[PDB]
Enzyme design. Sequence first.
Site, PDB file in Angstrom:
ATOM      1  CB  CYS A  93      13.268  -5.943  -3.364  1.00 19.96           C
ATOM      2  SG  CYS A  93      12.976  -5.303  -1.688  1.00 19.96           S
TER       3      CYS A  93
ATOM      4  CB  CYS B 150      14.328  -4.274   2.267  1.00 22.56           C
ATOM      5  SG  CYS B 150      13.868  -5.901   2.852  1.00 22.56           S
TER       6      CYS B 150
ATOM      7  N   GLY C  96      -2.910   9.158 -13.726  1.00 19.51           N
ATOM      8  CA  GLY C  96      -2.011  10.097 -14.388  1.00 19.51           C
ATOM      9  C   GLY C  96      -2.389  10.447 -15.819  1.00 19.51           C
TER      10      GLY C  96
ATOM     11  CD  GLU D 173      -5.534  -0.360 -11.557  1.00 22.01           C
ATOM     12  OE1 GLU D 173      -5.145   0.033 -12.678  1.00 22.01           O
ATOM     13  OE2 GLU D 173      -4.984  -1.297 -10.938  1.00 22.01           O
TER      14      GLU D 173
ATOM     15  CG  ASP E 120      -8.970  -9.986 -15.931  1.00 22.97           C
ATOM     16  OD1 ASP E 120      -9.272  -9.698 -17.104  1.00 22.97           O
ATOM     17  OD2 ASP E 120      -7.943 -10.631 -15.629  1.00 22.97           O
ATOM     18  CB  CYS E 121      -9.485  -5.221 -18.686  1.00 17.09           C
ATOM     19  SG  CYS E 121      -8.174  -6.265 -19.336  1.00 17.09           S
TER      20      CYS E 121
ATOM     21  CB  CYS F   3       4.652  -6.069 -21.476  1.00 17.53           C
ATOM     22  SG  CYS F   3       3.763  -5.044 -22.668  1.00 17.53           S
TER      23      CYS F   3
ATOM     24  CB  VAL G  28       1.151   8.258 -17.931  1.00 20.33           C
ATOM     25  CG1 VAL G  28       1.582   9.264 -18.968  1.00 20.33           C
ATOM     26  CG2 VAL G  28       1.194   6.879 -18.520  1.00 20.33           C
TER      27      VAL G  28
HETATM   28  N1  LIG Z   1      -5.928  -7.646 -15.770  1.00 23.01           N
HETATM   29  C1  LIG Z   1      -5.924  -6.368 -15.358  1.00 23.01           C
HETATM   30  N2  LIG Z   1      -7.077  -5.620 -15.414  1.00 23.01           N
HETATM   31  C2  LIG Z   1      -7.149  -4.321 -15.013  1.00 23.01           C
HETATM   32  N3  LIG Z   1      -6.058  -3.639 -14.520  1.00 23.01           N
HETATM   33  C3  LIG Z   1      -4.896  -4.358 -14.461  1.00 23.01           C
HETATM   34  C4  LIG Z   1      -4.752  -5.675 -14.842  1.00 23.01           C
HETATM   35  N4  LIG Z   1      -3.401  -6.085 -14.638  1.00 23.01           N
HETATM   36  C5  LIG Z   1      -2.807  -5.026 -14.163  1.00 23.01           C
HETATM   37  N5  LIG Z   1      -3.608  -3.910 -14.010  1.00 23.01           N
HETATM   38  C6  LIG Z   1      -3.422  -2.657 -13.584  1.00 23.01           C
HETATM   39  O1  LIG Z   1      -2.815  -1.834 -14.644  1.00 23.01           O
HETATM   40  C7  LIG Z   1      -2.084  -0.698 -14.177  1.00 23.01           C
HETATM   41  C8  LIG Z   1      -0.816  -0.409 -15.096  1.00 23.01           C
HETATM   42  C9  LIG Z   1      -0.153   0.948 -14.761  1.00 23.01           C
HETATM   43  N6  LIG Z   1       1.323   0.835 -14.853  1.00 23.01           N
HETATM   44  C10 LIG Z   1      -0.778   2.055 -15.630  1.00 23.01           C
HETATM   45  C11 LIG Z   1      -0.830   3.461 -15.065  1.00 23.01           C
HETATM   46  C12 LIG Z   1      -1.601   4.554 -15.835  1.00 23.01           C
HETATM   47  N7  LIG Z   1      -1.277   4.768 -17.323  1.00 23.01           N
HETATM   48  C13 LIG Z   1      -1.545   5.976 -15.099  1.00 23.01           C
HETATM   49  O2  LIG Z   1      -1.258   7.010 -15.756  1.00 23.01           O
HETATM   50  O3  LIG Z   1      -1.811   5.982 -13.824  1.00 23.01           O
HETATM   51  C14 LIG Z   1      -1.832  -0.965 -12.733  1.00 23.01           C
HETATM   52  O4  LIG Z   1      -2.511  -0.009 -11.935  1.00 23.01           O
HETATM   53  C15 LIG Z   1      -2.310  -2.456 -12.541  1.00 23.01           C
HETATM   54  O5  LIG Z   1      -2.717  -2.724 -11.210  1.00 23.01           O
HETATM   55 ZN   LIG Z   2      13.152  -6.977   0.660  1.00 21.14          ZN
END
Ligand SMILES: Nc1ncnc2c1ncn2[C@@H]1O[C@H](C[C@@H](N)CC[C@H](N)C(=O)O)[C@@H](O)[C@H]1O
Ligand SMILES: [Zn+2]
Length: 965
Positions: free
Chosen positions: A40, A43, A515, A533, A555-556, A591, A945
Amino acid sequence: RQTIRHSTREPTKATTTKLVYQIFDTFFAEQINAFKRRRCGVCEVCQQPECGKCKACKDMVKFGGSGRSKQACQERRCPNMAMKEADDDEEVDDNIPEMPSPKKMHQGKKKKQNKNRISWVGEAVKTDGKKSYYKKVCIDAETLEVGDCVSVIPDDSSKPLYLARVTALWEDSSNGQMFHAHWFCAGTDTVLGATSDPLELFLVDECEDMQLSYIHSKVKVIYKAPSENWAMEGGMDPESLLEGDDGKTYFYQLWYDQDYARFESPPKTQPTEDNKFKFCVSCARLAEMRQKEIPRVLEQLEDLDSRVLYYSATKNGILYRVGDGVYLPPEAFTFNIKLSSPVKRPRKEPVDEDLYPEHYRKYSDYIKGSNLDAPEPYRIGRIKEIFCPKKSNGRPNETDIKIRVNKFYRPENTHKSTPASYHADINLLYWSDEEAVVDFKAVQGRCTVEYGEDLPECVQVYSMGGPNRFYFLEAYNAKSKSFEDPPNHARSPEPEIEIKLPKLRTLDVFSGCGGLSEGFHQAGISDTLWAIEMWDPAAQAFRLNNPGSTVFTEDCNILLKLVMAGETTNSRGQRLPQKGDVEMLCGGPPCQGFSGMNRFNSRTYSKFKNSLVVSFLSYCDYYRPRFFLLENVRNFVSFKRSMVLKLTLRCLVRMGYQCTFGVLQAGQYGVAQTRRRAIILAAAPGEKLPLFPEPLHVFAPRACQLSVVVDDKKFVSNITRLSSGPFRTITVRDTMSDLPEVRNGASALEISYNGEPQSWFQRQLRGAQYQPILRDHICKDMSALVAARMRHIPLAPGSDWRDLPNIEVRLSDGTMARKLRYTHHDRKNGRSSSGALRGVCSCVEAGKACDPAARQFNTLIPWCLPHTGNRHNHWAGLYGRLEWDGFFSTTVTNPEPMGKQGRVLHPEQHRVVSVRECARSQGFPDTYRLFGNILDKHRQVGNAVPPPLAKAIGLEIKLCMLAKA
Ligand SMILES: Nc1ncnc2c1ncn2[C@@H]1O[C@H](C[C@@H](N)CC[C@H](N)C(=O)O)[C@@H](O)[C@H]1O
Ligand SMILES: [Zn+2]
Ligand SMILES: [Zn+2]
Ligand SMILES: [Zn+2]
Ligand SMILES: [Zn+2]
């Protein structure tokens, strides 16, 4: 990236089922790359200038060397190294939606055909007036019975060929040989567009009488209902009843709502035994809709000189009775209390530009006008009378229903004004003897308003117990501006009990810290027994909050492959979920990789084809849960020309699921934060497809643009509350006014609340903790220079870097902060009142380049901001403070003062918002546990969320569970 410009940059096939794979394989044919963390550039480290005195800079071209070790300067090891999460709705590509409602497709002229022979076959079977119905009809060889499908030709060629089911065959003495046409809708006319099966049709509530001469041809259309074992068919190989049928014949399986992009199981509406030979489900339903929306009074309780009173009236499927609570627009009426209007202003005095040189950069914002504030929540009133006027003869007018009500006051409606809302329950009201008369038509909905002292349980249980519930304890007298006990006529006086179905075993993929599951659990519909996760810290946190769940930190894609291969456990010794175990599947797949709006590519698609979205759909297909929930960033509906949204729906429709999609604003559900989420809901064939949650709190309009455009068609959800809502908006004050003052760099993981909760919001979030402990009220430790900047940002609402004073300042470390020097004359921004230049580099000149020596360091006012200011709307918001009356921006994952997405300074304290404050902005209970280092905790909170949002959605699913018989 061009190359490795100081960059510290840090099988492949997704697990799929044959059905999902084949759905996605059809697109973007290839016949005529791992994620890399960026830094980023914001900083105080990325800002650092290459010193040129270490193995790094000394191994680069600039400082005599070969471009071999691309490794960036050692004094630039970004602590905020991060992956570009697609969770970036930073595009606002719908801020100006200029479109109507999808005009009932088949609205148009059709072409009369010249069939040379149309004669009834058999004898009439009825004679309703001028209509004699027939069972069969014969046209030039072809034969038609009711239930058969035909095709009609539109007059406009810009329209497709129409397909319809003949629900009746009759002859009118005034029109000829007729028939009733119940139109089908071709897949390409739905949100699916060109991604649908060319043979699939959908049912719609569109029909019209028509002369048999308009019939173009007969067509076969078969119904494709879910099999006996639909829920076990996940993963199997694509079958077929017959090739000529589903392989080459038109078929259908679902009903479609064009306005809401809802695909649902066919209606069951029944035919009275008076029209088994002329029944049209469409008319039946359309008749229900017209009658369900005619404000109409019922039983009457008195007939007077000029009007007749009724005990109850019905509007929109809701029954309103005297004594009931009713929602009215803020325009419905005023209160006796005069809404005070302020006067005057500052005693005339401009700002000192020598001291505040970058303040002029605020004029563009100002003149550009300020954005609209959240509307007033609904006016609330008790029905005292329901009456109809009197016709010009002596009979009651029903085309005009009126209601006389008692005005209820919100604390902020009294002379005490807005400050009265700070500590009041959001659903606290005051009785009033003020009355108003409005048109029943103006009523927005029904609500319960009860005198608190007569309730059969405490206020809290009553409030958490059901929607639209309000209460009062005292009455308010505007004339004396006093509070007195309520009159007795203000008290009370098919109600059964509160059935509690069992929770659905839920598998949450890409669970993050939890969440979504927290809110679902709060809605009382689920028990997340399984979670996935891949990021450890967040996975640990999910464990902490759900001791009874099985968390997979991998990995899912690997777990799904195991269960598909027959595995029952995994290497770690955990029990894998099997068909029948998962009743509900929820998740938010990333995505990353296809977050752009530009159309898909042959290459860019081969990767999406293996993305986590496809993997998530694979889970859905295989487990065939009762309810499916896919949440994502608002732009999920737009990515890649909306192909990502259309293929996801397309894949669900193919599975036989009922599905829809919508966009929700989190602020409308109880949080002082702006955050829009895309929501895809799917439901099993034998379920009731949930509806999106009707907003609870009023929120800023500009943040509530919920509509979506796909291939030039505008879609909205079922949401009807577009202007007002039941509850006032939740502010930053509601969110953290009770938190103990901490300092920049706070690290005490456990401190005292040192005080009582203040807002209703706070009361809810601190919970009923025996020994209350304020956790994670810690915040990043900013450099001595950044800290100095923060303490110099005024507390006045809307203050930011443009308010910094250009002065010399000694820092906490000992070094001195020099003044910013205006070296170049920016002809665009002119000069200051005293005559000072405003440019800080050569670029403010005629195309000129950037004299590398023009850069300045350690200046209170960051040199970079005025440097590129003119090309970023003066970087409004950077080093800006949250406003007590405002809301958070989409909760940041790593608060940075100069971060684009960042408006993160505390309202009054000279620090950035703490981890806990951020969790408050997300609606997390104060007892919700997080895990890891401070940056890890921020990430957890921010990617989640908001529970209040998931709870709202959860209640909509609950309604469907209770409705299933
Ligand atoms: N291939 C994968 N398999 C499992 N989890 C993953 C993968 N790629 C990313 N993630 C995880 O997916 C999550 C996406 C989040 N933004 C979702 C948050 C969730 N809906 C909540 O309410 O906490 C993150 O915690 C990532 O680390
Ligand atoms: Zn930085
Ligand atoms: Zn160096
Ligand atoms: Zn009809
Ligand atoms: Zn420049």
